[PDB]
Amino acid sequence: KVFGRCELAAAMKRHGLDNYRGYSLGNWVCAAKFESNFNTQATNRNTDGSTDYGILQINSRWWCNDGRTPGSRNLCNIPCSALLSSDITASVNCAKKIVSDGNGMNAWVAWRNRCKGTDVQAWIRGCRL
C-alpha cells in the first residue's frame, strides 16, 4: 500500500505513535516519507548485507528476522516480511522498541539528516486528526 500523507498520519496516531517517546506525529510522518515514500512494500539492501523493510525501513541487522543476515538479531520477534503489510501494526510496534533503545529517532538516519530540526508539523498540516 502507498499511503497518503494524512492517511498515514491518522494510522500512526491510532496506533499510538503521536508523541511516543516525545516525538510528535510530524516526526514519524517525515521519517516515513524519506525512508519509504509512504510505501509499505519498500525494501532496501544495506552495504553490510542487512535489509531495511517497510514504511519505516526497519533493519534486519537487529530488529526482524529475514533468514539472510548473519548474524543479526530479531529484537522485535517478527519476520521482516510482516513489516511489509498494508496494516502498519507490526511496523509501529517495532518502531516503538527502536525509539526506546537510547538514541531516540537518530536510529533512522534519514530522519536525522532530513527531518530533525525542521518544521516537521508541515507533514500533518491540513490533516483531519
Would you state the cell numbers that stand for residue 5, as one nine-digit string?
Answer: 500523507
Q: Which is nearer to Na ion, 84 or 124 (CB)?
A: 84
Binding of residue 126 to Cl ion (CB under 5 A)? no
Out of Na ion, Cl ion, none, which partner does residue 55 contact, by CB within 5 to 8 A per kind? none
| Residue 91 binds Cl ion (CB under 5 A) | no
Judged by CB under 5 A, the number of residues near Cl ion is 16
For the question of residue 52 being annotated catalytic, the response is yes
Q: Any catalytic annotation for residue 7?
A: no
Give the nearest residue (CB) to Na ion.
Answer: 72
Give the separation between CA 57 and CA 53, rounded to whole angstroms: 4
Closer Cβ to Na ion, 40 or 69, answer by number = 69
CA dist., res. 108 & res. 114, Å (int): 10
Distance in angstroms (rounded) separating the CA atoms of residues 26 and 75: 26
101 marked as part of a ligand binding site:
yes
Q: Which of 35, 48, 66, 119 is catalytic?
A: 35
When asked if residue 93 is in the footprint of Cl ion (CB under 5 A), the reply is no
Q: Which residues fall in the annotated binding site?
A: 101
Give the active site residues: 35, 52
